[PDB]
Design a protein around this ligand. Sequence first.
Ligand code: K
Ligand code: K
Ligand code: K
Ligand code: K
Ligand code: MG
Ligand code: MG
Ligand code: MG
Ligand code: MG
Ligand code: MG
Ligand code: MG
Ligand code: MG
Ligand code: MG
Ligand code: MG
Ligand code: MG
Ligand code: MG
Ligand code: MG
Ligand code: MG
Ligand code: MG
Ligand code: MG
Ligand code: MG
Ligand code: MG
Ligand code: MG
Ligand code: MG
Ligand code: MG
Ligand code: NA
Ligand code: NA
Ligand code: NA
Lengths: 260, 130, 183, 71, 59, 141
Amino acid sequence: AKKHLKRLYAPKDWMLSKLTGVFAPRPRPGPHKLRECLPLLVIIRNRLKYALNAREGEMILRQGLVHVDNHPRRDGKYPAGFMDVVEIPKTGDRFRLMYDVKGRFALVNLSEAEAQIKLMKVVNLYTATGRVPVAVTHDGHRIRYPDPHTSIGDTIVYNVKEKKCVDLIKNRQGKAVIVTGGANRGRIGEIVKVECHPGAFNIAHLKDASGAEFATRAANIFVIGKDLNNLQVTVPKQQGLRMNVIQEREERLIAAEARK
Amino acid sequence: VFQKKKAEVCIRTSQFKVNKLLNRKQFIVEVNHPHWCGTVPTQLIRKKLATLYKVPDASQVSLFGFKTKFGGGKTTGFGLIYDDLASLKRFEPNYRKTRMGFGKARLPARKSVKERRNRNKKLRGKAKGK
Amino acid sequence: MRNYNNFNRVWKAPRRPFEKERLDREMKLCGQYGLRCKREIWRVNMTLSKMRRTARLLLTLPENHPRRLLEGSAIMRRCHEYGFLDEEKDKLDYVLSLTVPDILERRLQTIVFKAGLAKSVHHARVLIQQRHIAVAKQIVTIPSFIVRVSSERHIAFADASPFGNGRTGRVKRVRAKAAKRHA
Amino acid sequence: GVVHSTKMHRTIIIRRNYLHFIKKYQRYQKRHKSLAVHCSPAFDPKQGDEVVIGQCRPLSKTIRYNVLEVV
Amino acid sequence: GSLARAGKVKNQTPKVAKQEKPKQPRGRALKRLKYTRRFLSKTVKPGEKVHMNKQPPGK
Amino acid sequence: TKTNGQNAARKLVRLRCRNRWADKGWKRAHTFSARKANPFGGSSHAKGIVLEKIGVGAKQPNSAIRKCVRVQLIKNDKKIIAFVPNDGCLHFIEENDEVLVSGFGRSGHAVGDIPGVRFKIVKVSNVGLYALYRQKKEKPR
RNA sequence: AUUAGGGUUCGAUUCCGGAGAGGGAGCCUGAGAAAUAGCUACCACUUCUACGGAGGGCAGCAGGCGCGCAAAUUGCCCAAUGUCAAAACAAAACGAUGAGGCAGCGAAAAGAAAUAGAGUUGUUUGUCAUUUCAAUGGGGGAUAUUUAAACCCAUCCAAUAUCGAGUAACAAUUGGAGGACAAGUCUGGUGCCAGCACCCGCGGUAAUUCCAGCUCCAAAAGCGUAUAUUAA
Ligand SMILES: [K+]
Ligand SMILES: [K+]
Ligand SMILES: [K+]
Ligand SMILES: [K+]
Ligand SMILES: [Mg+2]
Ligand SMILES: [Mg+2]
Ligand SMILES: [Mg+2]
Ligand SMILES: [Mg+2]
Ligand SMILES: [Mg+2]
Ligand SMILES: [Mg+2]
Ligand SMILES: [Mg+2]
Ligand SMILES: [Mg+2]
Ligand SMILES: [Mg+2]
Ligand SMILES: [Mg+2]
Ligand SMILES: [Mg+2]
Ligand SMILES: [Mg+2]
Ligand SMILES: [Mg+2]
Ligand SMILES: [Mg+2]
Ligand SMILES: [Mg+2]
Ligand SMILES: [Mg+2]
Ligand SMILES: [Mg+2]
Ligand SMILES: [Mg+2]
Ligand SMILES: [Mg+2]
Ligand SMILES: [Mg+2]
Ligand code: NA
Ligand code: NA
Ligand code: NA
């Protein structure tokens, strides 16, 4: 099977320079999809800058100094992804892997009693041997006894340290969601309606805080709160609000001139 | 308008970060050498940084990648300040340790190693390695 | 192999190799601005051709078009910053009227002569190539250096040059060594 | 599609007529495709009839669709 | 036929050595020399045509 | 005149396809008859061995003996006639010598008053003929 | 690539997909192969041999022979980028890696840029003959810097203490000067010969065209020529 990953073929969100190397670290199979993940080596070397190169990254990772969802992960090819909690106890670092308004990965700093909570979107529900209902989540977790009201597309806020479900947010109109894929990835809005096309892709029509209306496929939405006012997780700085490109360029130019 | 004065070196650090994982502190080091003739030796920069950052031993300071600025008078590099000499000798790359005199001896030519490996792969035990 | 460093051309030869009017005009430009070859004029020609092409494309679009607004503001800002157009001229249609001397006047070789640091454009070019001119205390050795308006007031002799605050030059240094050795 | 032939047992041939655009000439041309479709004995369509077909697993060398509704 | 006449004129031509002359300027200095001679040395009379390589009378 | 219908693309495509063959340049590029008849076989230059020196009478109203050589190509053993440029360059050539041959500049058509000559000698003994003519190099012994 | 637009043309080649490992077929192992620096056979080529026998597959890297108009080193290194793995680094204690990276060769192509700058005297100016002044790299070196180590760049010619331009000989070329097409009623030579000439044409004793000198024109560290292709 494929063991390598050309740097040109690597996801653009990893921000690896096309001139520095032929290859990029190929994510191993695991919790998240290869195209929708951030490798641990990329996090430790290119984002956190704790490692100058891969050899120092190996030094840090093999010692189990980096924890993902309250578990040391020693593989630099481990596929960390959305809503994962990454903690380095030695440096006192705690952040959640999320998407900013531009669709890039963002390390949102977390406090204690916040790093113990992780949201998981239910992608499948089946019955195991012994008539045991099992819920499969977006990060590959299998839950042996979910809430009876759990449905596919819902989100389970899950205590990683105690390994137990603590609450469930249903996937209904009026709920706050974050887009996890497509051109609208990273936007935060409220479900206005969901159009159902059986045998095809359901379309979710959303509306952000400023009132902008956008759409995507139902697979790309991720419920994160009862409504936009009360979210169940800390979001990045820009709060999932897409901002006009012309206005953004003008504000950056003014801010740059104010600095100098 | 020219005046003859002794050349002086000013050290200046940016993007400073504390790396508890590798027991060191990382920073970009910029050297201002107005009337310096040629390039500032990295050993001299090591003494200046050790004094500037109150490092008891200059041997815990690791410097590399010094690029001089076009037009002269400036040099920019990268610096590492380790908590102790033991941490430096344990975590630093061998070639930088060799630059400091702490490196190991060079291994034999890899071609000879490849030659020996190919010869040995035709033999059974007690002949391989001889 | 597997190298992804981009590169592109910056000049194009004229369509008709021998036109008396064009050859005389380019000869006038070379003498006036102390240029080395026709390629320096043709580089300016291609630059202006690019700016006029996007300006024509933007002016085709309606005013309220977001692309015209963002791109039109950017190119006018670029012209104002580099002195191609005056600050008063704040319309996209004035980009179309840019001429070759407008770009050539902003060359560091031209600006140095106009500022008064050199007797002529040829003196200006050799001064630049000989590490004698600094822009905002940074030594610049490229005559085709396009000078920004905000950078115009910071042009002066380099601190490391003999004409500035630096040590003596080759002629004096060699004669000083000769005087010591002869004595 | 439109039923083109019903000479086979439980299998029918349908036509999908469509216009293909040619960019250079800024004009269309009429094209068509033929599909072998299984027809359940519950329909009984005729030549020229319009049918709705759904994609199924390979049922023969050429058959990939099943008749769902005869209009 | 009669290939023996190949190179007749080249062999016949009297050999005249190239005159030794001082070097001309190269590059920008050459361009400024041409510009000064073409547009600064003399004022062009209105209506006249500039002769770049006018030769002395002959025939 | 031509068809104009909105759904007449097939007719227009067919009309163009048939009529392109009337373009002599297009037919040459899209057939193999010229390539088969071309001694160079589509290449820009071909190496060869000089068979003899010949003198070709110039076409009227000119009157001259153009110096040429009969050359057998190494790649395909075809015999061609190649003009020797510049005066005295025929003496730089010997029989059974090894030459490089290029086109005469009109893509297989004859050039000037030389009848039926489409090739010219460029190198001899791995040395440029023009370099030999200008005495910047000497013919190897 | 070409370029108003519409189009025309190229795509063996970096990334994605497919296919192959001299030609064919067959197969074991394995999660995955119809694998080829794995096996079995035949065909075509081949190597060793003590004649009994035993072998080989560069469309991997480097490099040979042929083929051609046509294309580099049998180099250094795992420092970076990655892969595999029983594997962090370190400590008697350094995994492999021609994948890859770094240098050598390289005017395919692309970018920046020298070959000189200011005067003074005489011969409105300008040229020429003088005579001065300063500057600078090419290059030569280093307390050194770079680099895995080197090499290139960059920095400097004292910080008490560091080499160097005057025919700046440190000397610019390639094509042209009837017309298309910028540039000579120039001077010799040759005399339908030699040759030039993409086309029109030139040369047969006064050659604006050949062979040369002089002068001039064009592009310039580049400039001709051939073929193909795009515009025309
Ligand atoms: K090879
Ligand atoms: K000529
Ligand atoms: K004559
Ligand atoms: K001549
Ligand atoms: Mg004729
Ligand atoms: Mg291809
Ligand atoms: Mg082929
Ligand atoms: Mg491929
Ligand atoms: Mg295969
Ligand atoms: Mg082969
Ligand atoms: Mg293989
Ligand atoms: Mg096989
Ligand atoms: Mg092999
Ligand atoms: Mg075989
Ligand atoms: Mg390779
Ligand atoms: Mg080549
Ligand atoms: Mg180890
Ligand atoms: Mg080289
Ligand atoms: Mg020179
Ligand atoms: Mg030097
Ligand atoms: Mg290098
Ligand atoms: Mg003319
Ligand atoms: Mg031509
Ligand atoms: Mg001519
Ligand atoms: Na489905
Ligand atoms: Na200097
Ligand atoms: Na490695």
